[PDB]
């Protein structure tokens, strides 16, 4: 388990502007919690607590 922020093909965050969006998409996914944080190494973006370790996540490089 890990928290991260939660991506879609491919290698693309989920933008946001709520943390209730997040929550929602986080906890579908298994994770304990979700928010919408504004800044961090991905801004305005669903950022999962406890997420399983099966689910894509965002790593360096370009959306696609
Ligand atoms: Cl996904």
Same mark, same amino acid.
């Given at each position: @388990? ?8 491919? %290698?693309? @965050? /989920? ?5 209730? /969006? +997040? %929550? *929602? #998409?986080?906890? =579908?996914? &298994?994770?304990?919690? &979700?928010? +919408? !944080?504004?800044?961090? *190494? ?8 406890? #997420? !399983?370790?099966?689910? !894509?996540?965002?790593? !360096? &490089? =370009? +959306?696609?």
């Amino acid at each position: @388990v890990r928290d991260a922020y939660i991506a879609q093909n491919y %290698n693309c @965050v /989920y933008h946001c502007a709520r943390d209730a /969006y +997040c %929550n *929602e #998409l986080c906890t =579908k996914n &298994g994770a304990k919690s &979700g928010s +919408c !944080p504004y800044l961090g *190494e991905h801004k305005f973006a669903c950022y999962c607590k406890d #997420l !399983p370790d099966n689910v !894509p996540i965002r790593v !360096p &490089g =370009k +959306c696609h």
